User: What shape does this take?
Amino acid sequence: RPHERNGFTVL
Amino acid sequence: GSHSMRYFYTSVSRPGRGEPRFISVGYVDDTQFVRFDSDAASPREEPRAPWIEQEGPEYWDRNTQIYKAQAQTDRESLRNLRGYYNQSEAGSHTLQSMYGCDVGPDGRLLRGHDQYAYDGKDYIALNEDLRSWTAADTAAQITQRKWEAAREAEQRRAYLEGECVEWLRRYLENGKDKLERADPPKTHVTHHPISDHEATLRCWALGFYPAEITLTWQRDGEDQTQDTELVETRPAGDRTFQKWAAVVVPSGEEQRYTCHVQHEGLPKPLTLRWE
Amino acid sequence: IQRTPKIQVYSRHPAENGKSNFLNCYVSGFHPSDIEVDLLKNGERIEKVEHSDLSFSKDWSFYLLYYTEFTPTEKDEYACRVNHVTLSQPKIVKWDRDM
Ligand code: NI
Ligand code: NI
Ligand code: NI
Ligand code: NI
Assistant: This one.
């Protein structure tokens, strides 16, 4: 299953 | 075995034609198992392997919402990148993301991955330590400093050590008939006269999984590397793969040539001849 | 970055005249992802052609499989035609049942 946001924020 | 799970995201801007198109696909090993496409009629994560189908509605619903949020986030990332590099607002650009986990036979995490490319060049990547970043240039260092200040690595690390590994192990168990047991190639050698003095011997490997394979021709037991045409391994369209290797030989000397096939699904390496 | 696509055209199963099969055109190693791929029967575009979901390799280059159900015959000629920014003319690769 994929990772969620938050964490993994905008570049 | 050693196994991996990976997600591959691609966002492509098209200024003037609306928001960037976002596509994601997920793989376990060489098997694609899910997809999402933001240009679909009503975008949703969809199954692409039989063993994922047993996941309940909450699974698909949560992943669908995740992808829709990711498409928005990539759109903002693409706007930021355009600014970092001082690029015109008219052009199309590409943001690709790939992340996931490798585990060993005991199910323990061997390596985590989380990295990005802009316009097909490496941009930033989480290092093997899952705690620090490698940035390609001064633009990517802007992203790096932002992520360092916001403790991004720790949240990426939490996913890669926890949910990634736990869900991969689940998929391996649920799909074990398809994922844990290699399918050996079906093999044959064909012969094609070119002229009265030259013919092509082609060694075929069909229907094998996973994609890793080695095909080599030998002449009297010695490798013919410099003289073999080898095609790139290619998908059959049914989750299995194909490859062939060919050599041109003098007519009447075919019997000196053997094709050797190595693949995880074979009990032992094969030796094939024209027969 | 621009990278020129590799192209292979081939059948899912060994060809047998009069037996239903799949015709595949695999395009790979390309960038950017915008690409046009048509399967042709006797030079004409085949209409019901599907394709795999856009994916990429560890070097970030893209790959796609385009495919259609077909029944090979002695006479019918099949090919794949690809247009991409790296190609100054369309690349046409003929299907050869021995490849
Ligand atoms: Ni295993
Ligand atoms: Ni034979
Ligand atoms: Ni350029
Ligand atoms: Ni399409």
